[PDB]
Amino acid sequence: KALKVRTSATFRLPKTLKLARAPKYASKAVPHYNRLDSYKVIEQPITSETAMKKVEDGNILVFQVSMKANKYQIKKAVKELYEVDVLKVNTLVRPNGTKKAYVRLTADYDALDIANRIGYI
Amino acid sequence: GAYKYLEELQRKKQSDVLRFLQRVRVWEYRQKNVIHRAARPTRPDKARRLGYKAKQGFVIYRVRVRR
């Protein structure tokens, strides 16, 4: 009779094969479409007098955006919907529960012309 | 069959043979968990006459209870 040598007095659970799931059927079988596309991210512009004076003074577009949108998604949506390059995004949750995004554009883009192209002012 | 011998033998609980088996087994069960799956009935004749079948979907558990 032979016996194996054990340097440790502790027995550990041996490593056995862990198979990846190979399901017989799909879990839902229709993937959900994008829950946050650019249209869902950007709800509408904000057109108060303060937001507008920010538009022609700070190169800033003020938007009401989805409460589920983070600064990355807001940056990506603005670039896609309006084809402007974004310098910075500041966000806040307004006292009415909506989210406001201050989206400052680069020096290469104006905020007046974009606001005009979108439609307000 | 053998189930008739098992049924008669199980009734002799205080014979030498069943007393030995009883002591060894009661130690074994105490070492295991309070509730644990049994791989098979230790009393095949008793399980049968209660309605156990040796087929997929019949399960035996072992449980101990404080007296």
Added chain:
Amino acid sequence: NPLTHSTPKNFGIGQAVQPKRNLSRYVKWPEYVRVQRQKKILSIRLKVPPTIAQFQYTLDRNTAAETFKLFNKYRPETAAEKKERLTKEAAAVAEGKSKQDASPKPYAVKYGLNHVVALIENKKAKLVLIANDVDPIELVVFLPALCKKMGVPYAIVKGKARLGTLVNQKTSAVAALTEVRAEDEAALAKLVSTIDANFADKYDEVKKHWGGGILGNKAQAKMDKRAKNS
């Protein structure tokens, strides 16, 4: 060599932190390993009533090899051969139709505990092999007595797995020959004689002797030192 020397380390107490050593003796095993080892231990520590420990008197290697050689000549039909002879029977029913006799009479090992016990009670069995490691042992513990009562030669033999492999099962727990062919009648008779000299002819004495009561290594050492000392 001028560049290699002898370090030798001092693996004594207080010096040279110990080297790796075989610690298998001190391994803390999982409880199921513990329970099966200590189950084997406790079953030989206690006194074993003769009805048990008549078992673990097992057919020794040479006549076990002989017995299983004779038995392997009478293996039951597998699924393949059974359906092949089913086709042969269908072919006869198509063309011959004697009565139902395309296939010839079979000579197969009988197995199944209920089947074998009834075979013994009817005195049809000519050799019975009992597995020595059935759990619960109640299923076979009466078999040597029944075989002795009914005049049926029996052998307690190592391996329900070994019995099972000659009947295409994982475990048979019992095997029996009720009849053989002429070419094996002499081999059956000589093996029955040796098996009787080993099991049935010792039954009256074996029934009187208790097993177990064996000590562990350390207790046995400390007993024989006090036997010598005082």
Added chain:
Amino acid sequence: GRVIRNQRKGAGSIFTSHTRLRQGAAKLRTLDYAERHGYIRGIVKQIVHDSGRGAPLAKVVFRDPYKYRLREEIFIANEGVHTGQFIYAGKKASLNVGNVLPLGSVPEGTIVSNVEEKPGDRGALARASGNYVIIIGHNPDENKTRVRLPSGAKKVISSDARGVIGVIAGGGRVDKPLLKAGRAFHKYRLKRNSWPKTRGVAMNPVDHPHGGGNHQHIGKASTISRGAVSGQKAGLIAARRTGLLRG
């Protein structure tokens, strides 16, 4: 009518030990092969105060015998043990203050401390400041050692139980009067919520068996049977005698 003060303590809510500042349990080394067969050398790295404990503690560093690393220990410093001193703990250790020896391998009249009640329990006897155990006899067959405990009782310990040569340091502490409630306050702030104590007679009958009456008095004997039940055992429990100790 109400659960009395000594009964509430067992619920262990506000009466637990104040353990935040403590250095860790004071223990000998776990009884290993080295100290069963030979001895092992440690170094006294610190002598440190321990909150709630009168005696100082010695942090002694030993090398692990089985892997390259240092294991630290929290001994109760015996008097005369200094930092940088080498401790030797084993069957073959020398009879010097601070060393840890089996009881069977020290002569008659040896003064030890932190004695094991059972071999391997890592010290149970003579642990408070100034206390010590005297080895008063050996019984080599079925090896036992007769000892004298700090309370005066005669104990029979296995000769393989261990102890530290010398007396627990910090002795003479209770010789100094506290002089004032505030010093008792700070002493027990580090121990547990046993202080101050209200006298049972000062209470009401709902609060204590001593309570009530138009004078402060006990009214029945203060000596209580050992078999009295919780809520009754307030006084002098199972007293064999009372009164000023004067034969």
Added chain:
RNA sequence: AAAGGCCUGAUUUUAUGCAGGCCACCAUCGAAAGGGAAUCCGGUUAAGAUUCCGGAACCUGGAUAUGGAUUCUUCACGGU
């Protein structure tokens, strides 16, 4: 209690499986006054700012060449 994750370098049908290494730890919740990576000044509003604007910094996680340093006494030299 059989409670487990960390590198290999390979390999350049190559994904990261795959032969050695290491490890003895073992949930999680618990502080907007405890511990803790890193920001300031000036200006600006009706109402915001160490958060916006201008200027000037810093930290962290990434990637990444150049210069410099070292290097045929290979892994710097000086100072008792």
Added chain:
RNA sequence: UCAAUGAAGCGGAGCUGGAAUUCAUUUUCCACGUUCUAGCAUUCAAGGUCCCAUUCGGGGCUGAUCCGGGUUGAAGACAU
């Protein structure tokens, strides 16, 4: 039933040293690498021996006696 430990060195037998004024008789026991010193002690260990076909390296044994896989101590049919 109690306690501990990352269940690491338990039990038995050896070997060697040693007192034994041991007879070739473990019938004997003993001891089994560490004590001036706040250093250091880890890389399957260097060395010895053997082999691979050895590809810079790898594997054996030994170093580090053998055997029983009862982790070890307490306690015990009492206690619980």
